[PDB]
Amino acid sequence: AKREPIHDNSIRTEWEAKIAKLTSVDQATKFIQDFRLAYTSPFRKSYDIDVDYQYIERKIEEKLSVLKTEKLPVADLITKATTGEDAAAVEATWIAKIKAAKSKYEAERIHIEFRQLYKPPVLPVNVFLRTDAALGTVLMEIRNTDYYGTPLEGLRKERGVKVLHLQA
């Protein structure tokens, strides 16, 4: 109905209050994963904070990152995800998943979900970036094969849009 101001508003303030209550890496990791699944990507559960979610995500990241440096052994910052998983094992899992994808629709959701679950600070930056690059290579190879082969009418059905208007 009526948006509040862009950069300072009650939605961002409410989420800042929630973030301030996070006191452990485990708690903040569940918080950020739940947040990214709920509010990010075309497959998000809700657009209710659309104009604020990117700023809020930044603030969650900052909280988790400081909790990591305050609470974790330094070596874990290099070798582990904040889920407790080994970072190289996460890379191996998700590369294998996308290499097994049978369509661009399976592959796109694998890549999107990898980012929702493991975007830094969950996974170390160097491991994340090289995994994201490997996944994107495969996703593009599948998507860009015969890119113009399906008519728009077919793509609309494959995507699953509800068509609300087509100008004559």
Partner 1 sequence: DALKVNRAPVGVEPQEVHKWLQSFNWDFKENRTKYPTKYHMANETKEQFKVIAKEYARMEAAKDERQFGTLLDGLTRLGAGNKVHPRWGETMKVISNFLEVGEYNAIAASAMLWDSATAAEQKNGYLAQVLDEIRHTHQCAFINHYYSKHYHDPAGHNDARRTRAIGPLWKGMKRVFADGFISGDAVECSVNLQLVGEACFTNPLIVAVTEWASANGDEITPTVFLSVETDELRHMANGYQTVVSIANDPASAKFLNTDLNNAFWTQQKYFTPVLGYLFEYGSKFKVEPWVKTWNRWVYEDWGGIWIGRLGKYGVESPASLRDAKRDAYWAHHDLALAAYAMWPLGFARLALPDEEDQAWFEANYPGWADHYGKIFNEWKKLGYEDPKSGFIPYQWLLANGHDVYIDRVSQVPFIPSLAKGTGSLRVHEFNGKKHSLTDDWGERQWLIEPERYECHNVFEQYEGRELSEVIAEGHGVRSDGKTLIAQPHTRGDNLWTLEDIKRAGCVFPDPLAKF
Partner 2 sequence: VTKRGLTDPERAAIIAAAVPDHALDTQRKYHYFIQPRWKRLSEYEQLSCYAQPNPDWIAGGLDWGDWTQKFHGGRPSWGNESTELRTTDWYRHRDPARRWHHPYVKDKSEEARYTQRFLAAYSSEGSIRTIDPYWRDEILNKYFGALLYSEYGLFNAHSSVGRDCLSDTIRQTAVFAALDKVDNAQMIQMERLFIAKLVPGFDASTDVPKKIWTTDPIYSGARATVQEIWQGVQDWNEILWAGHAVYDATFGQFARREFFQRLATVYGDTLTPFFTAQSQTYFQTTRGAIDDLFVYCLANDSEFGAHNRTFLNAWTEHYLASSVAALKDFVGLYAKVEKVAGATDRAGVSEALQRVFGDWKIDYADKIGFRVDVDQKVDAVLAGYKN
Instruction: Determine, following the binding rule CB under 8 A, whether residue 101 of this chain makes contact with partner 1.
Output: no
Residue 86 three-state SS: strand
In one-letter notation, the amino acid at residue 10 is: S
Instruction: Determine, following the binding rule CB under 8 A, whether residue 91 of this chain makes contact with partner 2.
Output: no
Beta bridge partners of 80: 86
Half-sphere exposure of 153 (CA within 13 A, CB side): 0
Instruction: Determine, following the binding rule CB under 8 A, whether residue 21 of this chain makes contact with partner 2.
Output: no
Angle at the Cα of 29 from the Cα atoms of 24 and 30, rounded to 5 degrees: 105
Stretch that binds partner 2, among 26-34, 83-91, 136-144, 158-166 (CB under 8 A): 136-144
Stretch that binds partner 2, among 15-23, 61-69, 84-92, 146-154 (CB under 8 A): 61-69
Give the count of beta carbons closer than 10 Å to the beta carbon of residue 148. 5
Give the residues lining the site for partner 2 (CB under 8 A).
6-7, 40-41, 51, 54-55, 57-58, 61-62, 65-66, 69-70, 74, 77-78, 108, 111-112, 114-115, 119-121, 124-126, 128-130, 132, 135-136, 139-140, 143
